[PDB]
From Swiss-Prot:
It comes from Homo sapiens. Residues 44-64 are annotated as: Disordered. Ubiquitinated; mediated by RNF41 E3 ligase and leads to proteasomal degradation, impairing inhibition of apoptosis. Deubiquitinated by USP8/UBPY. Autoubiquitinated; mediated by E1 ubiquitin activating enzyme UBA6. Anti-apoptotic protein known as inhibitor of apoptosis (IAP) which can regulate cell death by controlling caspases and by acting as an E3 ubiquitin-protein ligase. Unlike most IAPs, does not contain a RING domain and it is not a RING-type E3 ligase. Instead acts as a dual E2/E3 enzyme that combines ubiquitin conjugating (E2) and ubiquitin ligase (E3) activities in a single polypeptide. Ubiquitination is mediated by a non-canonical E1 ubiquitin activating enzyme UBA6. Homodimer; antiparallel. Interacts with RNF41. Interacts with DIABLO/SMAC, likely with higher affinity to SMAC dimer than SMAC monomer; this interaction blocks the substrate-binding site and inhibits the caspase inhibition activity of BIRC6. Interacts with KIF23/MKLP1, USP8/UBPY, BIRC5/survivin, MAP2K1/MEK1, RAB8A/RAB8, RAB11A/RAB11, PLK1, EXOC3/SEC6 and EXOC4/SEC8. The chain holds residues 1010 to 2600 of 4857 of the full protein. Belongs to the BIRC6 family. It is found in: Golgi apparatus, trans-Golgi network membrane; Endosome; Cytoplasm, Cytoskeleton, Spindle pole; Cytoplasm, Cytoskeleton, Microtubule organizing center, Centrosome. The gene is BIRC6. Residues 47-56 have a biased composition (Basic residues). The BIR domain is essential for its anti-apoptotic function and is important for binding to DIABLO/SMAC and caspases. Disulfide bonds: none annotated. This is Dual E2 ubiquitin-conjugating enzyme/E3 ubiquitin-protein ligase BIRC6. Expressed in brain cancer cells.
């Protein structure tokens, strides 16, 4: 009878996922609100990005959405109640309480929003038994903008029911007066052919055995491990729905985390990793023990398997979660990352071929053209990732507004919309036809200051038939529009890009780069299913890894360690490792042979760790000696390594041993004057000159030998010799655009939290690099 009790075949999994998909309530609910809340017509609210062409399929906001602006009355700061009557009895999935706060908000207000049924704070005490989604902090719903957001009011009680609601918004300008605008949408459960679908959903929610079986099938600990990737996708859809509804499932997740992390981030694709990241974000948001520490333990237990991960896009989400959750047990994360980095750097250095060194030096090319296995592809924690798993989508412009057109200024050619007259606040559009219904997964439209906003609508049959709004980017003028790994990837043949010119601008002609679109030209049978859609219309692992996978792992580990130092006892540890010998090994492995980013990040990590240690100057002088002596046959980018060394010394110049050791090295090199390695003298003199620019007996010796050098003398070296001599003499004292379809499900706050995690990690890395 119940789908919960049956074996988890693809049919049962498909039915269970169908029992969780949502629709927007087709006829708009009626509402009564306090007088201080005044309704605004949805056409006015959507004037910038009109939706009228979707009216034929009820896609416009006037059919499901109410919006009220607040008038700052005497008591507008205090309790408010929105009574909401639905057109008909229905299986309500959730209530989307969108909000916009005043731009001049100093601190995010402390407002609780709760959902109740019609016939703790006193109003909720009186209506305690009718509470349908407990008090949710308004701040929980914030978008990345800081003053905006959404609360997806939902609960098991809401699912266990079927005409009227109350939204109680109480502040614990003051309080609710900081809430400039509110809007409400209601979303029901899709119409399913499944018998007793209400009881089916109840069974999904109540039974712990169901959660245990879901975890087991996800972890492939059932049915001989022959659970398909699509089955895992369906299981994660069900798990995400359960986590969103509930906020015992957490107990099963905590007990099987290590396996869940392994299966989702190391053995599956980008989509599975992203869905598991959303599930784990929901679990994080959810009297039980904290989930963050357990997730950290699972991630660090699986860290050793990173060289055996299947896709780069999967590793991206692993490291996003790890970087967010490292705050717990900082020392343990540091130890794991350092151990794996040291293990991987040795192999990466061992994998450098002479042809690769020649490419790096003679041409500055750091790819491995002889190794066919790439691991990750990016476009630009601020970029699209895992683009190897998706296909670049070619498109042809089929219609344009006015005289605008597209022009071209395997991957599709870079194309841009040329618009002859942009005006200000003027709408222009371009319709791109992919030639066939394609499975759209990623979009990147670069920043364009020429336009105030951009919007993407998608359809297959016609704009009025099955038109969907894919995204609205209001900050496209200042930020790139990046839609990364659309979890319910849309199916689209036609994409309408609608751009609005910048407010206060008459730049006659505009050239807007259309950007890049990724996905699949072949839609799999289950990826086009009208069902399952919302709103339908150990050391051997390192040895066997590829060079590119090791490079990606090194990049992520270096970023993790840099952010670890920024977030700093983690420096107390990383002293037992990354001592003088370990520091030298890591430099030799990564800064000499590594990619420019790996080189830079390893160098800066080494400064921030050991830059203040006594042996640091000896380390730098030893590196200079070993790498630039005329007897060194090693092929490496001497110029790039020297720039790295100069940066390292400049940022470590507070260490008195740096310049002391470099001047002692210069002294030893000039000893023959009082065998002469002129190129090493040149390198050392240039480095010391830059370090002195950034700013007794031993100094007497070095300056004397410099004098003998210039007396016994190339002309170019003489200038720097004189500069360094003078400097040494004088130096001594005694001389953002989410996909619009996330609103329909329970995975919008999870996606916002994932984006917040990525943004915080990027900010931490940038701060660490720019110390």
């Amino acid at each position: 009878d119940l789908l919960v009790d049956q074996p988890f075949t693809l049919e049962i999994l498909t039915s269970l996922v169908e029992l969780t998909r949502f629709e927007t309530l087709t006829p708009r609910f009626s509402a009564t609100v306090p007088p201080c809340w005044v309704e605004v017509q949805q056409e006015q609210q959507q004037r910038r990005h009109p939706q009228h062409l979707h009216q034929q399929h009820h896609g416009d906001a006037a059919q499901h959405t109410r919006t009220w602006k607040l008038q700052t009355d005497s008591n507008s700061w205090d309790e408010h109640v929105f009574e909401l009557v639905l057109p008909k009895a229905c299986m309500v999935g959730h209530v989307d309480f969108k909000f916009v706060l005043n731009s001049n908000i100093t601190n995010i207000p402390q407002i609780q929003v709760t959902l109740l049924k019609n016939k703790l704070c006193p109003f909720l005490e009186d209506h305690k038994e009718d509470i349908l989604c407990g008090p949710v902090w308004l701040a929980s719903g914030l978008d990345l903008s800081g003053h905006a957001g959404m609360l997806t009011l939902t609960s098991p009680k809401l699912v266990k029911g079927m005409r009227s609601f109350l939204i109680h918004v109480k502040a614990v300008l003051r309080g609710c007066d900081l809430l400039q605008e509110v809007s409400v949408t209601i979303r029901r459960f899709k119409k399913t052919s499944i018998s007793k679908e209400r009881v089916q959903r109840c069974a999904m929610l109540q039974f712990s055995e169901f959660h245990e079986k879901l975890v087991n099938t996800l972890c492939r600990k059932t049915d001989d491990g022959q659970i398909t990737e699509h089955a895992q996708s369906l299981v994660l859809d069900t798990l995400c729905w359960l986590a969103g509804v509930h906020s015992n499932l957490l107990s099963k997740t905590r007990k099987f985390l290590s396996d869940i992390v392994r299966v989702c981030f190391f053995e599956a694709g980008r989509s599975i990793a992203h869905k598991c990241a959303r599930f784990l974000a929901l679990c994080i948001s959810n009297c039980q023990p904290a989930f963050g520490p357990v997730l950290l333990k699972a991630l660090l237990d699986n860290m050793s398997f990173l060289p055996a991960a299947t896709t780069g896009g999967s590793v991206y989400w692993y490291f996003v979660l790890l970087n967010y959750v490292k705050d717990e047990d900082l020392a343990g994360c540091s130890t794991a990352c350092a151990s794996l980095l040291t293990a991987v750097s040795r192999q990466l250095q061992d994998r450098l071929t002479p042809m690769e060194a020649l490419l790096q030096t003679r041409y500055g090319l750091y790819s491995s053209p002889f190794d066919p296995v790439l691991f990750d592809l990016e476009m630009s924690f601020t970029s699209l990732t895992g683009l190897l798993e998706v296909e670049p989508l070619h498109f042809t412009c089929v219609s344009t507004s006015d005289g605008t057109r597209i022009e071209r200024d395997q991957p599709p050619p870079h194309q841009s919309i040329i618009i002859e007259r942009m005006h200000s606040g003027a709408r222009r559009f371009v319709t791109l036809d992919f030639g066939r219904p394609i499975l759209l997964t990623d979009v990147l439209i670069p920043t364009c200051g020429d336009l105030a906003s951009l919007s993407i609508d998608i359809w297959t049959l016609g704009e009025e038939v099955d038109g969907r709004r894919l995204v609205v980017a209001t900050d496209i003028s200042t930020h790139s529009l990046i839609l990364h790994d659309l979890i319910p990837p849309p199916v689209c043949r036609f994409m309408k890009i609608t751009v609005i010119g910048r407010y206060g601008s008459t730049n006659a002609r505009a050239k807007i780069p259309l950007g890049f679109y990724y996905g699949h030209t072949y839609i799999l049978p289950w990826e086009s299913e009208l069902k399952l859609m919302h709103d339908p219309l150990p050391e051997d692992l390192i040895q066997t890894s590829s060079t590119e996978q090791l490079r990606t792992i090194i990049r992520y580990l270096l970023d993790t360690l840099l952010s670890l130092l920024h977030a700093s006892s983690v420096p107390a540890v990383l002293q037992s490792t990354f001592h003088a010998q370990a520091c030298e090994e890591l430099f030799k492995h990564l800064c000499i042979s590594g990619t420019p980013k790996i080189r830079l990040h390893t160098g800066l990590l080494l400064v921030q760790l050991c830059g203040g240690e006594r042996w640091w100057g000896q380390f730098l002088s030893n590196v200079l000696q070993e790498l630039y002596n005329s007897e060194q046959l090693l092929i490496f980018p001497q110029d790039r390594v020297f720039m790295l060394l100069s940066c390292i010394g400049q940022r470590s110049l507070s260490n008195s041993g740096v310049l002391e050791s470099l001047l002692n090295l210069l002294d030893n090199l000039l000893s023959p004057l009082q065998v002469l390695d002129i190129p090493m003298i040149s390198w050392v003199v240039m480095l010391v000159s830059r370090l002195l620019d950034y700013v007794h007996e031993r100094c007497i010796s070095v300056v004397q030998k410099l004098v003998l050098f210039l007396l016994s003398m190339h002309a170019d070296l003489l200038l720097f010799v004189c500069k360094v001599l003078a400097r040494i003499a004088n130096a001594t004292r005694p001389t953002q655009a989410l996909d619009a379809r996330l609103e329909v499900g329970l995975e919008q706050q999870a996606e916002l939290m994932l984006k917040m995690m990525s943004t915080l990690e990027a900010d931490s890395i940038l701060q660490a690099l720019t110390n």
